[PDB]
């Protein structure tokens, strides 16, 4: 999503989908390569991403995500 709508909210309200901010794919496109996704790039996600949040299987929330950038 470049921008929200209530359908965003709907699919936000329907967490069966993982809802992504636009720049990261541009990033991936500018990387010429799929950059694997993390909260850098999203608004909201099904929990399976969150079990991923170690870059592997062991956490749940936020007050965490950043890769040593400014």
């Amino acid at each position: 999503a470049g921008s929200e709508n209530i359908r965003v909210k709907n699919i936000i309200l329907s967490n069966k989908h993982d809802v992504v901010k636009p720049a990261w794919l541009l990033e991936c496109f500018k990387t010429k390569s799929f950059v694997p996704w993390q909260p850098r790039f999203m608004i909201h996600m099904c929990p399976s991403t969150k079990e991923h949040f170690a870059r592997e299987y062991d956490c749940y929330g936020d007050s965490y995500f950043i890769d040593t950038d400014l």
Binding site: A54, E56, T68, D69
Partner: protein, 201 residues
Amino acid sequence: MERKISRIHLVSEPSITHFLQVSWEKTLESGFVITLTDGHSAWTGTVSESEISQEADDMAMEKGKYVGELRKALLSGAGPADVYTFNFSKESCYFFFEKNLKDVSFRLGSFNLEKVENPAEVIRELICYCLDTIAENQAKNEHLQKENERLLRDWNDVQGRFEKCVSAKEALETDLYKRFILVLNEKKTKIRSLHNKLLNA
């Protein structure tokens, strides 16, 4: 009590500066004593409130307006468009003073005068007063200069410092974020350590 002295020239004496001194109690309308001189001799006269009433009511005028005019004429309240003119005969001790408009003169008032027997004494008094007056303004100007100095210093100081502070405020955040991002990696190190230990055991 108000005094007011004024450098004048009688028409009879173009080259002699004459000096018109006025003393009165806050109000020229109430009456006043007048003294004229030319550095060798002096003269004095007197006018009352009722004299001014009579003058102003022969001016066809409201008294007070004619008083403002008098403030302009005798207390040097005249403006650039104001051209008063003064006439006095030392032989007759009779003064009068006029107003120049329409290329013509208009006698504003006229006083019975008398030569003073002690010119030098009124002179000392006037000029002692004047000396005092001078001196006061001198001291005042001195002080004023001093604080002008102080403020001009302070302004430069605070301006430079405020600029420097803005500079540092823009400098701070990158310092902070470098300081973090390394520690954040380090805790990510400790995280990956315990996580691989958990997957091994």
